[PDB]
Amino acid sequence: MASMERFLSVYDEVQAFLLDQLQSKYEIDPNRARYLRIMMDTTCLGGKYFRGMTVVNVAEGFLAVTQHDEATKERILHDACVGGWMIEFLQAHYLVEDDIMDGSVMRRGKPCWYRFPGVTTQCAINDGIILKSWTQIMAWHYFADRPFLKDLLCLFQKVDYATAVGQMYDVTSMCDSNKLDPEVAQPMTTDFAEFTPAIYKRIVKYKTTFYTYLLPLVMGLLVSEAAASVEMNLVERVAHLIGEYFQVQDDVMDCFTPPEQLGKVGTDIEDAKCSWLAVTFLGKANAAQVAEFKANYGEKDPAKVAVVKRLYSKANLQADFAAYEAEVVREVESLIEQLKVKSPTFAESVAVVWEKTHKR
Amino acid sequence: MASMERFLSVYDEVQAFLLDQLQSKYEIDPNRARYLRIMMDTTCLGGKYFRGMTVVNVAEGFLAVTQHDEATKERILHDACVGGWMIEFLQAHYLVEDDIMDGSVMRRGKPCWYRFPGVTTQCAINDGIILKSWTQIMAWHYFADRPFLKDLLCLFQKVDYATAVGQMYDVTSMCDSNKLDPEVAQPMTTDFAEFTPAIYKRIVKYKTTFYTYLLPLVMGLLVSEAAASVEMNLVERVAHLIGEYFQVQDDVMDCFTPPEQLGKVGTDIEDAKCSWLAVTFLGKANAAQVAEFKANYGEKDPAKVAVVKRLYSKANLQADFAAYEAEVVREVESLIEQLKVKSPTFAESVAVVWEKTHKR
Numbered sequence: 001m002a003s004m005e006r007f008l009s010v011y012d013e014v015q016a017f018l019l020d021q022l023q024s025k026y027e028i029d030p031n032r033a034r035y036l037r038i039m040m041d042t043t044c045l046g047g048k049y050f051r052g053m054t055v056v057n058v059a060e061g062f063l064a065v066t067q068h069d070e071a072t073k074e075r076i077l078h079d080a081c082v083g084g085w086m087i088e089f090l091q092a093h094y095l096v097e098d099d100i101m102d103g104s105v106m107r108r109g110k111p112c113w114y115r116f117p118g119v120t121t122q123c124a125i126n127d128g129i130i131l132k133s134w135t136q137i138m139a140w141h142y143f144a145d146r147p148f149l150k151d152l153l154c155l156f157q158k159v160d161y162a163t164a165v166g167q168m169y170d171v172t173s174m175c176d177s178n179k180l181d182p183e184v185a186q187p188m189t190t191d192f193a194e195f196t197p198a199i200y201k202r203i204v205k206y207k208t209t210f211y212t213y214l215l216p217l218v219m220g221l222l223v224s225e226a227a228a229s230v231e232m233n234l235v236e237r238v239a240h241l242i243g244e245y246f247q248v249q250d251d252v253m254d255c256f257t258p259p260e261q262l263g264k265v266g267t268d269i270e271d272a273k274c275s276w277l278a279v280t281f282l283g284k285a286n287a288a289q290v291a292e293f294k295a296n297y298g299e300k301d302p303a304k305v306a307v308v309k310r311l312y313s314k315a316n317l318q319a320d321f322a323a324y325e326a327e328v329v330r331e332v333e334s335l336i337e338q339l340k341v342k343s344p345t346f347a348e349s350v351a352v353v354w355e356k357t358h359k360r
Numbered sequence: 361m362a363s364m365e366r367f368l369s370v371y372d373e374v375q376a377f378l379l380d381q382l383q384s385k386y387e388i389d390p391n392r393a394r395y396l397r398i399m400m401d402t403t404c405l406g407g408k409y410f411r412g413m414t415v416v417n418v419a420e421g422f423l424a425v426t427q428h429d430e431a432t433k434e435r436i437l438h439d440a441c442v443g444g445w446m447i448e449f450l451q452a453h454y455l456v457e458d459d460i461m462d463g464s465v466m467r468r469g470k471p472c473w474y475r476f477p478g479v480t481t482q483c484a485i486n487d488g489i490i491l492k493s494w495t496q497i498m499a500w501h502y503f504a505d506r507p508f509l510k511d512l513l514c515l516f517q518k519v520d521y522a523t524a525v526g527q528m529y530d531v532t533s534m535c536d537s538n539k540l541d542p543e544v545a546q547p548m549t550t551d552f553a554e555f556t557p558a559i560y561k562r563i564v565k566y567k568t569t570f571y572t573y574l575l576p577l578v579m580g581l582l583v584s585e586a587a588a589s590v591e592m593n594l595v596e597r598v599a600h601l602i603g604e605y606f607q608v609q610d611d612v613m614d615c616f617t618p619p620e621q622l623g624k625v626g627t628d629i630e631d632a633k634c635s636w637l638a639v640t641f642l643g644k645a646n647a648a649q650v651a652e653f654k655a656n657y658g659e660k661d662p663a664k665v666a667v668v669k670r671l672y673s674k675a676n677l678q679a680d681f682a683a684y685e686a687e688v689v690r691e692v693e694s695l696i697e698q699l700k701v702k703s704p705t706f707a708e709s710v711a712v713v714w715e716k717t718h719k720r
């Protein structure tokens with residue numbers, strides 16, 4: 001069975017399980033079950049399933065170099081699928097809530113869930129909550145007798161929290177830390193002194209890397225009973241590196257990818273995001289360029305957004321990007337080599353993860 | 361040590377733990393730690409701590425009739441305190457998010473968290489997320505080697521999900537089930553055919569009773585290693601009963617308690633809530649009264665709200681309330697007696713829970 005087709009079949013099984021349980025234990029009626037079914041399909045389905053399929057892929061690598069009964073292979077693959085759907089539903093939680101937080105309009109070329117006419121923010125906040133609760137309902141049902149249950153739950157928990165922390169880093173990234181105060185309306189930074197590589201790196205590490213790269217890799221190890229076969233510090237370090245590279249691409253596209261290809265009109269400039277373009281610009285700009293930037297960044301006015309985009313074009317940030325990229329390729333390959341010491345076949349799963357990130 | 365003073369001391373300890381961990385493992389800076397500290401104090405502190413103190417109280421009852429070393433008593437009480445704070449933080453999660461969902465203005469005589477000038481909805485949705493993640497960080501840290509950890513996590517998980525389900529029942533309670541559809545803007549019901557006691561009961565059971573009564577009672581049993589000493593079906597049945605009574609009081613106050621005593625301007629009528637007043641009214645009204653109700657319910661217009669309040673006064677719902685109350689007193693006392701069979705001292709903790717609900 002091809003990995004993708006196995007993974008999508010399990011979606012159906014998990015969906016049927018969750019909804020049958022709502023009926024039989026939670027007194028749901030058919031119409032509210034239908035609403036939740038559509039919510040699940042709309043918020044969970046339609047991407048590439050890179051995160052979920054990572055769990056499956058790691059697990060397949062382990063199976064190919066380990067002795068198991070056929071029924072144990074199926075069990076392990078089914079577990080990887082379920083584990084993968086937990087990460088996919090965790091993302092869907094965060095995407096629903098983040099879209100509401102940010103006033104987003106579109107996502108993957110369709111309206112954000114909260115904007116559906118029969119949804120509204122009042123319901124969508126709660127729907128987002130449900131999406132995360134379903135992660136835990138999955139885990140407890142399918143992994144009830146599994147030896148990895150505790151470690152999986154504890155890991156999941158920590159990634160979740162890290163992601164929420166990162167969300168806090170992200171939405172506060174345009175304020176001056178020393179002015180943060182629940183009592184006082186927050187001004188945008190005027191100096192941009194916190195648009196640094198170290199600061200940028202923290203936002204991304206927490207907001208994106210833990211749930212996108214670390215979790216899928218380590219969950220693939222946990223369901224395979226393979227974690228003690230790899231050096232975990234290396235898994236952490238390579239995840240953070242690749243996850244950083246992923247976000248830098250996403251930042252570059254926000255500004256330069258046409259909206260019909262992005263699936264989104266990008267607003268990073270208008271939202272004054274601590275983006276890789278702004279940090280990297282500020283790291284090479286002269287005084288005049290910096291002042292022009294401060295006079296136009298973080299304002300909805302299209303003329304002002306056009307000025308910042310001009311500044312970024314003239315600043316030759318493609319060069320700094322290719323230099324960043326070259327250094328990431330070096331470090332990732334170094335970490336892949338280090339991972340060959342104890343786990344050559346895991347190393348190759350990491351290599352496929354890096355290739356799919358590096359190309360797309 | 362008095363139970364309240366122990367419980368509030370543990371808040372400080374848990375707060376210091378969470379924030380020290382953010383610094384030492386999550387790269388937080390002092391200002392963002394300060395923001396989270398204030399968020400925690402603002403959203404977790406200031407109520408009666410009925411839910412959290414329930415866990416402590418159950419545990420104290422067990423200690424008084426069981427043999428333990430002094431250090432084991434302290435351990436058990438500390439665990440009950442931590443367990444209690446998990447429920448208190450779970451409530452704070454739901455209160456933050458519900459206030460945003462509903463456009464609430466005030467809560468306990470102060471502004472809702474999202475309305476704080478330096479917060480905003482963009483941050484508060486995420487702050488609400490954090491509040492729930494902290495429940496799991498507590499549990500994993502303080503209960504890592506505890507024999508009850510799995511059952512506590514599994515219970516917590518199920519209550520959480522039930523509460524989110526109930527929130528869905530609540531916010532959809534004024535729509536016709538057969539019209540629910542994410543694609544189509546939802547009209548308010550015109551027939552009010554779903555304002556029934558069975559329907560009302562489901563909203564409340566899920567939205568409120570599981571996290572307010574069932575969870576605190578059963579968590580008190582789990583930390584005490586006492587769950588196999590009580591009949592769990594009876595704990596469920598008495599929790600649902602008391603939790604229903606609690607909500608009926610809350611519904612009655614929304615409409616009749618002056619806003620300075622409520623801590624809130626009540627909007628149940630304007631929001632067209634499936635409230636005990638509306639259901640009970642509809643269960644005794646004549647044709648004329650029903651038509652007048654349909655012509656004024658669920659509309660912000662103060663004249664229209666005043667009409668509904670008049671209808672409720674003239675309808676003599678105090679009588680149906682005293683009849684409801686008498687029946688609840690009967691059933692609760694019956695269940696308390698049933699609980700004396702296997703667990704007399706637990707029965708008394710349930711009796712204190714009922715008294716504190718019945719009087720306040």
Ligand SMILES: O=C1NC[C@H]2C=CN(C(=O)c3ccccc3)CC[C@H]12
Nearest residue numbers: 061062065226229342343344345346
């Ligand atoms: O137990 C082991 N010791 C040597 C090691 C040799 C090859 N293996 C891996 O590279 C591998 C590890 C984790 C997950 C997927 C694959 C399998 C595990 C083997």
Ligand SMILES: O=C1NC[C@H]2C=CN(C(=O)c3ccccc3)CC[C@H]12
Nearest residue numbers: 421422425586589702703704705706
């Ligand atoms: O193991 C037991 N069997 C009889 C029973 C007699 C009294 N007990 C209770 O009523 C009790 C139960 C759970 C929590 C708090 C108190 C203690 C447990 C005792």
Ligand SMILES: [Zn+2]
Nearest residue numbers: 098101102170
């Ligand atoms: Zn965002």
Ligand SMILES: [Zn+2]
Nearest residue numbers: 250251254268
């Ligand atoms: Zn982006």
Ligand SMILES: [Zn+2]
Nearest residue numbers: 458461462530
């Ligand atoms: Zn509400």
Ligand SMILES: [Zn+2]
Nearest residue numbers: 610611614628
């Ligand atoms: Zn109310």
